[PDB]
Amino acid sequence: MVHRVWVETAHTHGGEYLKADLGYGEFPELEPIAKDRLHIFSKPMQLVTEKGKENMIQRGTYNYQYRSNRPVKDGSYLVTAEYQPTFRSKNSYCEQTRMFGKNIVNVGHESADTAIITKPVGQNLEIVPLDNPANIHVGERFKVRVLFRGEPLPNATVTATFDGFDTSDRSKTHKTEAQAFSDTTDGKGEVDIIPLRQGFWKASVEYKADFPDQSLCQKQANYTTLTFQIGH
């Protein structure tokens, strides 16, 4: 199984702590980070608000569970997670792998702000929402932009699925990778996700390129995810 990174947040109101989960594995099944993988997630997930980025605290039964340091007010925030760069041999060349996850969390039933969630956080490969998904009904268009090394990335494939779309016969050795959406970005790096069902959605984009410093490593693979809610 190829493991990927995503973020999930609990439904949260103003005045309570924000609870979040680092998914490393096969969406949407959360799993504890294994002993031999703890070094990859050496930095905690981050909460992005008006005051910028802050670390979250790893609290809970399982090591993928985090909470905000302080109770959060009503608003629209980001929770980010990162697979720190790892190097492996392939064939024979070196490849660096990096993964990123970002969750849009609306704290409060009427929160649909865009000031925070539309600003890039600096992920090497990033999906930046250009609108708040709380305003998107089934069949409507939800515009995002893909950034690579800070610049818009054209002709990249963005796919998207939701929790419960593909469940038949899931096991440790079976499928459930079907997507309910796929399109490619334009010259501005933008693409409209069109959700056909309410629920917990995950959009995905990957980019393989040359590693910047060719004297040290040759290739670089990036896998980036954006999670959000459609409906209420």
- Select from 8-16, 49-57, 171-179, 212-220 the region that touches a copy of itself (CB under 8 A): 171-179
User: Taking CB under 8 A as the rule, does residue 221 contact a copy of itself?
Assistant: no
User: Taking CB under 8 A as the rule, does residue 177 contact a copy of itself?
Assistant: yes
**Minimum distance from residue 159 beta carbon to a copy of itself (Å):** 5
Q: How many residues bind to a copy of itself according to rule CB under 8 A?
A: 21
What part of residues 120-159 is at the interface with a copy of itself (CB under 8 A)?
Answer: 141, 159
User: Taking CB under 8 A as the rule, does residue 181 contact a copy of itself?
Assistant: yes
- Characterise 215 by phi-psi region: left (phi > 0), alpha (psi -120 to 50), beta (else): alpha
Compute the radius of gyration of the chain from its Cα atoms.
17
**Minimum distance from residue 176 beta carbon to a copy of itself (Å):** 7
Bridge-based pairing of strands 52-55 and 65-67 is unpaired
Distance (Å, whole) CA 46 – CA 217: 28
Interface pick for a copy of itself out of 42, 89, 92, 173 (rule CB under 8 A) = 173
> Nearest CA to 226 among 212, 218, 195, 217?
195
**Minimum distance from residue 141 beta carbon to a copy of itself (Å):** 7
User: Taking CB under 8 A as the rule, does residue 180 contact a copy of itself?
Assistant: yes
Interface pick for a copy of itself out of 194, 209, 217, 221 (rule CB under 8 A) = 194
- Give me the DSSP letters along 2-55: --EEEEEE----TTSPPEEEEEEESTT---PPPGGGGGGG-S--EEEETTEEEE
Q: How far, in whole angstroms, is CA 212 from its chain's centroid? A: 24
Token pair of 91 as six digits: 């064939």
User: Taking CB under 8 A as the rule, does residue 175 contact a copy of itself?
Assistant: yes
Element (H, E) at 100: strand 93-107
Residue numbers at the binding site for a copy of itself (CB under 8 A): 141, 159, 165-166, 168, 173, 175-184, 186, 192, 194, 196-197
